[PDB]
Ligand binder design. Structure first.
Ligand SMILES: Nc1ncnc2c1ncn2[C@@H]1O[C@H](COP(=O)(O)OP(=O)(O)O)[C@@H](O)[C@H]1O
Ligand SMILES: [Mg+2]
Lengths: 131, 811, 131
């Protein structure tokens, strides 16, 4: 039994610049920062003006408390998960990542020890520790 | 304050190009889709704002969008806009994350304004639009041009990893100069108060910073010392700029490859003579008069008979004080600088003797003596007159006769007569103006005699600090000359862009038949072609007995039909006309054109000055021809200067700094979107984006293309059998792009912008199973980033929370 | 200076003063101590201070470097359009989330005292509380 309300609240105002409401684009990032992924249908079902209370309730319902970053690496699936570091960086850049090279170094600071081949389970574990 | 004429012209620059993609294939609105629009009560109520950001609402239709404004804050009210009033938005890009505007997905006008604005509000005032550097005046010291920043931009191994800066331009210009032995010119333009002279001095200081010393410090010190001296004699407080340059400045400099100026040469042109006679309200004359009258010591005031700043006809008695300007401290610096220019103390005393004599002469009053109507010096002021001529080392009796005695030719006989009061005042005034102008130019000639190289310049760094295009209510002759200058610089800009693109295509084997070029040849000719131009017919009319403004205009309209670039005025067609300048139509008033064009001291007065016993005063007019001839006409002299100057500039590699004034209140962090957009247009920044995007604007080496586009067809890209150049062909053939969207060069893949955007989407489609993984990784890192930024300011927050709990106790 | 001694004597017990009472005094004297200051004197002298140490504590709490410019940093950080204003909700979330967080009611009371308008010139808010 582990309460995330305080973390959910802080994150909201980090992405909303401390306002009690949040723009739809910033809400997608917020939910994505806790591993939450919505279908385009579930997206269209959302309110047009999302406020804090709405988000706190959605987060309780959608956060994967057991596996917050399932969508990076799922332990239920036998992924035995390990791809090349420069390809990883290529894919991130292909998909128009807002991570600057400093951020990608932040990412590599959190998830890489040694210049190995990067394991996604490591990524998922490391981000889980930093929540 | 934002004029309704400024809203009118800003709204003409506004265009809508690309379509908004607010709907999915289903025809449903993308959840949260954002656009810019110019329809908003925020915009009707706040003239600083031209666009707002909105969300398109579920349910809109392709032909009439329903939107709700989100930035600036609004009401939540839905309302409807036609799609031609919606513009794409770069919704998730960090404007600080890169330096050129053209890297934005959408470069429409509201997107450009918002990108510059957010950079500027973070004190990043420099942005490129290759080959242009945009510099926005922050109206405060940002601290970004100190010696520490010079050393940073100079000594950093890879300066492209620093943000754009005027020092990036100084470094790249000096590097090319010493890299391929090619002269360079840095051309700084913009409207009044936009920051051109500050930028110029910042670049000069960079060039003066040597890594390990400058044996020619004596010459560099004289060159740098000239900045306060040129500002004192040539700059004035206007309503738009407390330190307005009233001349254009061209410099040549010789600079060692590690810094340090070894030689130079200065040129001032287009000095506003009239300013020394009268000034509009809330405006001053040239700083030097106020520096001198307030700064001179008691012995110098007594020697020259100086009175106070409020006691001179030639000085507006009500504007003598400028906030933030200590004319006494400025004078001390000017005196120190003149010494650093190797003027002796005797030289400096002559200089200020002449300045005091011009002021004193302005205070001589004339009267109508009727016994025809003749002029005379008020007897009360005859001593003031004599002291004025003594201060100028001029013969008092001969100067008197030239101001009072006229010689007319009637029939074919010389008839002595007398100037009336009005004409004699004009002559007294023109002597004041001519002595001041020639003294300014004499100081520059002295400077040049100490800093120039013996045999001329081999390779040199040029710098031009000049008015950009000027469009005022009343445009007069001064504006014509300025706007002709900027047509010449426009051509230098369009030529170098074309030259450089054509060379790259040719070196790479790509066909240049697709290249575009927007000539301004026709408009330069309508302004300057000999015999068939405005400047030609201004000269002819000046050199004609019974020439008139209206005859000048008339002769122009009748003879310049064969090109659209001349347009007569619908309203007041007799003494007004319009030119189709590259930036749009500009309306000039020919009133007084012939007067202003002839405002050159000539004739016997010049011979009296040349006969002064003082060696400096003899040199003021050294070598002037005796006389009305075209060699004495401002417009004819100006075109010779210009042609000479552009031949020099065109022989160099140019760099373009385009300065922007973001508001008319001299304030920091204040952004007036209509005034800025008008400048984006007059500086060709929007055009530079267009120019760059055209044709095959995306180029990458085979292995760059492959590092960037591996996953378009990961098979063809990881085939060790085929060569890099051949991999690119494979990938491109299998991508689905039309042959028209790309070409393969010697060493590079050429793509049209649209082709590169398609290929980017194609690659993302092949990587769809990473979308969710990358989304979560990205968002989680951004949350961490946003938290680290907060943590920096927490100590400050503790202080706020602490004082709140203090005030709670005190209650 | 006598106020110093007088306030100490009202709160003293057995010659020593608790840190919570020393902080209360220090505010009566117009100082603004924070948990950082209370941690400093705890590391040195524990939870109860002799008069001499209570004066040392008052020294730590002077914070001369306090000024409008140093206090507004966090509010400016969230003022993206650089208007000089934040809403009351924005400043409430900031004051109640990070640092020596106030309670919701404490944050409201402080904002509602300074102004009755939703948008608050935060430079002036900080100048007002610095008095
Ligand atoms: N880069 C700058 N940094 C700080 N202040 C500037 C800067 N550029 C201009 N200013 C301020 O604007 C004023 C006018 O700038 P100036 O360079 O004289 O404009 P211009 O030469 O274009 O007419 C300066 O005196 C200065 O107060
Ligand atoms: Mg200037």
């Amino acid at each position: 039994a582990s309460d995330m309300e305080e973390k959910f609240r802080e994150a909201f105002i980090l992405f909303s610049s401390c306002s009690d409401h949040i723009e739809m684009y910033k809400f997608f990032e917020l939910m994505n920062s806790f591993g939450i992924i919505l279908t385009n249908d579930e997206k269209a079902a959302l309110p047009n003006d999302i406020n804090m209370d709405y988000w706190l309730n959605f987060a309780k319902k959608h956060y994967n408390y057991e596996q917050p970053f399932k969508h990076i690496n799922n332990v239920n699936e036998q992924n035995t998960v390990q791809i090349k570091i420069d390809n990883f960086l290529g894919i991130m850049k292909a998909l128009d990542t807002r991570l600057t090279e400093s951020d990608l170094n932040i990412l590599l600071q959190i998830t890489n020890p040694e210049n190995k081949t990067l394991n996604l389970k490591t990524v998922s574990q490391k981000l889980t520790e930093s929540i | 304050a934002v004029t309704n004429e400024e809203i009118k012209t800003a709204s003409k620059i506004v265009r809508r190009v690309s379509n908004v993609e607010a709907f999915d294939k289903s025809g449903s609105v993308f959840k949260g889709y954002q656009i810019w629009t110019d329809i908003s009560p925020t915009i009707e109520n706040d003239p600083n704002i031209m666009f707002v950001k909105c969300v398109v609402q579920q349910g809109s239709k392709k032909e009439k969008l329903t939107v709700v404004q989100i930035d600036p804050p609004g009401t939540g009210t839905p309302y409807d806009i036609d799609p031609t009033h919606a513009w794409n938005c770069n919704s998730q890009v960090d404007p600080m994350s890169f330096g050129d505007i053209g890297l934005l997905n959408h470069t429409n006008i509201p997107c450009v304004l918002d990108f510059l604005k957010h950079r500027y509000l973070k004190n990043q005032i420099y942005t490129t639009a290759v080959p242009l550097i945009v510099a926005i005046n922050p109206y405060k010291d940002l601290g970004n041009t100190t010696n520490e920043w010079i050393r940073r931009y100079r000594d950093t191994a890879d300066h492209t990893k620093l943000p754009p800066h005027v020092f990036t331009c100084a470094r790249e210009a000096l590097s090319n100069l010493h890299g391929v032995n090619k002269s360079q010119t840095i051309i700084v333009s913009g409207e009044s108060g936009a920051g051109k002279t500050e930028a110029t001095k910042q670049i000069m200081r960079y060039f003066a910073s040597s890594k390990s010393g400058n044996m020619d410090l004596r010459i560099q010190t004289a060159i740098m010392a000239a900045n306060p001296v040129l500002e004192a004699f040539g700059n004035a407080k206007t309503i738009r700029n407390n330190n307005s340059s009233r001349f254009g400045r061209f410099m040549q400099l010789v600079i060692s490859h590690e810094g340090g100026i070894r030689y130079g040469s200065v040129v001032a042109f287009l000095l506003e003579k009239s300013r020394i006679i009268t000034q509009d309200d809330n405006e001053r004359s040239y700083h030097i008069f106020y520096q001198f009258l307030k700064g001179a010591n008691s012995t110098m005031k007594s020697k020259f008979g100086l009175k106070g700043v409020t006691e001179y006809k030639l000085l507006n008695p009500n504007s003598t004080e400028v906030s933030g300007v200590d004319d006494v401290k400025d004078f001390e610096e000017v005196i120190e600088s003149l010494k650093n220019m190797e003027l002796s103390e005797s030289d400096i005393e002559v200089i200020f003797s002449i300045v005091a004599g011009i002021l004193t002469l302005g205070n001589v009053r004339l009267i109508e003596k009727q016994e025809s109507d003749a002029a005379a010096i008020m007897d009360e002021d005859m001593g003031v007159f004599n002291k004025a001529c003594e201060l100028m080392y001029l013969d008092p009796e001969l100067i008197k006769r030239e101001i009072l005695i006229k010689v007319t030719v009637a029939g074919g006989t010389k008839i002595e007569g007398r100037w009336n009061k009005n004409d004699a005042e004009v002559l007294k005034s023109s002597l004041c103006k001519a002595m001041y102008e020639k003294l300014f130019l004499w100081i520059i000639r002295h400077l040049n005699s100490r800093i120039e190289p013996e045999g001329g310049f081999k390779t040199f760094m040029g710098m031009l600090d000049i008015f950009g295009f000027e469009v005022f209510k009343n445009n007069s002759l001064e504006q014509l000359f300025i706007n002709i200058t900027n047509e010449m610089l426009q051509k230098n800009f369009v030529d170098i862009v074309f030259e450089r693109e054509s060379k790259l295509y040719k070196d790479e084997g790509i066909s240049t038949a697709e290249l575009k070029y927007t000539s301004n040849k026709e408009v330069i000719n309508v302004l300057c072609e000999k015999g068939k131009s405005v400047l030609s017919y201004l000269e002819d009319q000046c050199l004609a007995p019974g020439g008139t403004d209206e005859k000048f205009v008339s002769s122009c309209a009748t003879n310049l039909k064969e090109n659209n670039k001349f347009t007569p005025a619908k309203v007041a067609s007799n003494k007004n006309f319009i030119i189709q300048h590259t930036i749009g139509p500009i309306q000039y008033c020919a009133e007084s054109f012939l007067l202003k064009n002839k405002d050159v001291l000539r004739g016997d007065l010049v011979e009296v000055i040349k006969d002064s016993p003082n060696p400096i005063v003899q040199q003021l007019f050294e070598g002037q021809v005796i006389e009305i001839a075209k060699g004495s006409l401002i417009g004819s002299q100006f075109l010779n200067q210009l042609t000479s100057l552009m031949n020099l500039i065109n022989s160099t590699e140019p760099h373009f700094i385009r300065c922007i004034k973001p508001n008319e209140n001299k304030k920091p962090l204040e952004w007036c979107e209509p005034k800025i957009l008008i400048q984006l247009h007059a500086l060709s920044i929007l055009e530079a984006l267009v120019l760059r995007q055209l044709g095959y604007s995306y180029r990458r080496t085979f292995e760059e293309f492959l590092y960037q586009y591996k996953f378009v067809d990961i098979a063809a890209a990881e085939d060790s059998s085929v060569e890099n150049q051949n991999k690119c062909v494979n990938i491109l053939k299998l991508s689905g792009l039309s042959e028209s969207m790309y070409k393969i060069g010697k060493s590079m893949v050429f793509l049209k912008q649209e082709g590169a955007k398609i290929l980017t989407k194609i690659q993302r489609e092949k990587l769809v199973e990473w979308e969710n993984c990358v989304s979560v990784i990205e968002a989680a890192i951004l949350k961490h980033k946003y938290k680290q930024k907060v943590n920096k300011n927490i100590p400050s927050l503790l202080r706020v929370q602490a004082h709140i709990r203090k005030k709670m106790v005190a209650q | 200076e006598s106020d110093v001694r007088i306030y100490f004597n009202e709160k003293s017990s057995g010659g020593k003063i608790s840190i919570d009472n020393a902080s209360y005094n220090a505010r009566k004297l117009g100082l603004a101590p924070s948990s950082i200051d209370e941690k400093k004197i705890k590391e040195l002298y524990g939870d109860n201070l002799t008069y001499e140490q209570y004066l040392e504590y008052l020294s730590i709490c002077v914070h001369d470097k306090d000024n409008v410019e140093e206090l507004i940093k966090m509010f400016a950080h969230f003022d993206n359009n650089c208007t000089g204003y934040l809403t009351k909700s924005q400043m409430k979330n900031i004051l109640t989330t990070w640092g020596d967080a106030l309670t919701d009611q404490e944050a409201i009371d402080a904002l509602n005292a300074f102004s009755s308008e939703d948008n608050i010139d935060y430079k002036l808010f900080c100048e007002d509380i610095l008095q």
